[PDB]
Design an enzyme around this catalytic site. Structure first.
Site, mmCIF file in Angstrom:
data_model
loop_
_atom_site.group_PDB
_atom_site.id
_atom_site.type_symbol
_atom_site.label_atom_id
_atom_site.label_comp_id
_atom_site.label_asym_id
_atom_site.label_seq_id
_atom_site.Cartn_x
_atom_site.Cartn_y
_atom_site.Cartn_z
ATOM 1 N N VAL A 35 7.078 -9.932 -2.089
ATOM 2 C CA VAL A 35 5.596 -10.689 -1.719
ATOM 3 C C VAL A 35 5.030 -11.020 -3.058
ATOM 4 O O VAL A 35 4.900 -10.316 -4.037
ATOM 5 C CB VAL A 35 4.669 -9.946 -0.975
ATOM 6 C CG1 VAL A 35 3.297 -10.598 -0.473
ATOM 7 C CG2 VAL A 35 5.270 -9.294 0.560
ATOM 8 N N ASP A 146 4.657 -0.134 12.639
ATOM 9 C CA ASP A 146 4.467 0.513 11.362
ATOM 10 C C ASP A 146 3.145 0.265 10.954
ATOM 11 O O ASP A 146 2.814 -0.065 9.949
ATOM 12 C CB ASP A 146 5.577 -0.541 10.211
ATOM 13 C CG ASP A 146 5.759 0.263 9.096
ATOM 14 O OD1 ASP A 146 5.381 1.719 9.120
ATOM 15 O OD2 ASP A 146 6.257 -0.269 8.024
HETATM 16 O O1 LIG Z 1 2.228 -9.896 4.081
HETATM 17 C C1 LIG Z 1 1.773 -9.298 3.062
HETATM 18 N N1 LIG Z 1 2.678 -8.252 2.551
HETATM 19 C C2 LIG Z 1 3.663 -7.511 3.188
HETATM 20 C C3 LIG Z 1 4.472 -7.881 4.275
HETATM 21 N N2 LIG Z 1 5.574 -7.195 4.626
HETATM 22 C C4 LIG Z 1 5.851 -6.212 3.834
HETATM 23 C C5 LIG Z 1 4.933 -5.552 3.005
HETATM 24 C C6 LIG Z 1 3.744 -6.206 2.589
HETATM 25 C C7 LIG Z 1 3.219 -5.646 1.580
HETATM 26 C C8 LIG Z 1 1.797 -5.116 2.039
HETATM 27 C C9 LIG Z 1 1.020 -4.429 1.034
HETATM 28 C C10 LIG Z 1 1.228 -4.356 -0.255
HETATM 29 C C11 LIG Z 1 2.669 -4.848 -0.473
HETATM 30 C C12 LIG Z 1 3.466 -5.333 0.308
HETATM 31 C C13 LIG Z 1 0.542 -9.699 2.366
HETATM 32 C C14 LIG Z 1 -0.171 -10.696 2.968
HETATM 33 C C15 LIG Z 1 -1.231 -11.083 2.318
HETATM 34 N N3 LIG Z 1 -1.794 -10.709 1.191
HETATM 35 N N4 LIG Z 1 -0.918 -9.560 0.510
HETATM 36 C C16 LIG Z 1 -1.223 -8.839 -0.506
HETATM 37 N N5 LIG Z 1 -2.278 -8.996 -1.207
HETATM 38 C C17 LIG Z 1 -2.557 -8.151 -2.496
HETATM 39 C C18 LIG Z 1 -2.846 -6.807 -1.997
HETATM 40 C C19 LIG Z 1 -3.433 -5.675 -3.246
HETATM 41 C C20 LIG Z 1 -2.193 -5.338 -2.484
HETATM 42 C C21 LIG Z 1 -0.157 -7.893 -0.413
HETATM 43 N N6 LIG Z 1 0.400 -7.905 0.341
HETATM 44 C C22 LIG Z 1 0.115 -9.020 1.191
#
Ligand SMILES: O=C(Nc1cnccc1-c1ccccc1)c1ccnn2c(NCC3CC3)cnc12
EC number: 2.7.11.26
Length: 347
Positions: A35, A146
């Site tokens: 991501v 999940d």
């Molecule tokens: O769709 C996303 N993440 C995912 C989708 N599929 C699998 C895993 C993930 C994931 C979720 C959380 C963390 C790492 C990965 C996603 C969408 C929008 N903002 N965003 C963020 N922002 C930044 C914030 C500080 C962490 C982080 N991740 C996202």
């Protein structure tokens, strides 16, 4: 470095457009892929880009699910596009989503590290929005599979929560068996631990109850690195499952288990609101059908403070959108709109 792609909008007709972005940085990693965060040159808006390896044998299930979702508590698919990546002869699917700056995992961790608990106003706001997003996806037969703090994105200033990661999401149709190895450690429903393949969307409700209990406790309610350990922790709180409760969840486990008869009030700190404890015991039930539905959880008295017309965020701002329910969102129990949409609400 400005990257220009021809991306297809997430919703509406398949009419691709030139999308330019810059300031790309990794914000998430995992077995799913990567991501990224990026800035759209046009509006300056921040977006997240989920990049995954695209299978040549079939259409991506997460994309098909994302293209049909439109909810304020679910991360929006703005665009999608195909590209190359780390592997040479491989094709990647890129999902351009709304960017959300925090997670319930990080926020709760800041409170735990500071020996403080997240204020109950945030527990109500976050949990309510999680239940709205679940009522929405469950209305289409879709189970996220999940639910965990890391998949609950937050804007700290607006207190908006957005569910993310639809990589395990699936439409559950009665009679079709489903893999039991979904769901993360601490948040798995007891029927998943027992290896049931006939589970329903109520597994998301068990996971949400684990997030609620964790936000109240400051640590996971059912820890353990194995299913046995998790079940011991579950049994210490809920008591031993009766033979009927086992039959209702488990696939032929009729059972050398430890015999425990424990009050829910004694699980949490004495300052815990009684409506929060009552909501936990209704979400965290052995029999999957006994658990409250997401829409019923939204109407729980624990969220009455959110329906007060004078409620404000600790930062002085107004609460985010909470009452703009649709017919789709309310379809499991339309009469609940009488509690869900308070008199002052115009949404
Ligand atoms: O769709 C996303 N993440 C995912 C989708 N599929 C699998 C895993 C993930 C994931 C979720 C959380 C963390 C790492 C990965 C996603 C969408 C929008 N903002 N965003 C963020 N922002 C930044 C914030 C500080 C962490 C982080 N991740 C996202």
């Amino acid at each position: 470095k400005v990257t220009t792609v021809v991306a297809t909008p997430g919703q509406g007709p398949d009419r691709p457009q030139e999308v330019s972005y810059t300031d790309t940085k990794v914000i998430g990693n995992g077995s799913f892929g990567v991501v990224y965060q990026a800035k759209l040159c046009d509006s300056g808006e921040l977006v997240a880009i989920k990049k995954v390896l695209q299978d040549k044998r079939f259409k991506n299930r997460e994309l098909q699910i994302m293209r049909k979702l439109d909810h304020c508590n679910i991360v929006r698919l703005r665009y999608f596009f195909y590209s190359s990546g780390e592997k040479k002869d491989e094709v990647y699917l890129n999902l351009v989503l709304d960017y959300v700056p925090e997670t319930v995992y990080r926020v709760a961790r800041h409170y735990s590290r500071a020996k403080q608990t997240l204020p109950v106003i945030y527990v109500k706001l976050y949990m309510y929005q999680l239940f709205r997003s679940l009522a929405y996806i469950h209305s289409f037969g879709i189970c996220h599979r999940d639910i965990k703090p890391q998949n609950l994105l937050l804007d700290p200033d607006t207190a908006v929560l957005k569910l993310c990661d639809f990589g395990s999401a699936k439409q559950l149709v009665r009679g079709e068996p489903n893999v039991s190895y979904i769901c993360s450690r601490y948040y798995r429903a007891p029927e998943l631990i027992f290896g049931a393949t006939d589970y329903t969307s109520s597994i998301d409700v068990w996971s949400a109850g684990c997030v609620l209990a964790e936000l109240l406790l400051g640590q996971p309610i059912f820890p353990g690195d194995s299913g046995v350990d998790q079940l011991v922790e579950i049994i210490k709180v809920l008591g031993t499952p009766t033979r009927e409760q086992i039959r209702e969840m488990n696939p032929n486990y009729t059972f050398k288990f430890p015999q425990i008869k424990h009050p829910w009030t004694k699980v949490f700190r004495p300052r815990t609101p009684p409506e929060a404890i009552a909501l936990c015991s209704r979400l965290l039930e052995y029999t999957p059908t006994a658990r409250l539905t997401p829409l019923e959880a939204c109407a729980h008295s624990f969220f009455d403070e959110l329906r007060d017309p004078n409620v404000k965020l600790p930062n002085g701002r107004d609460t985010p959108a909470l009452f703009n329910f649709t017919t789709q969102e309310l379809s499991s129990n339309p009469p609940l709109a009488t509690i869900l949409i308070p008199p002052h609400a115009r949404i």
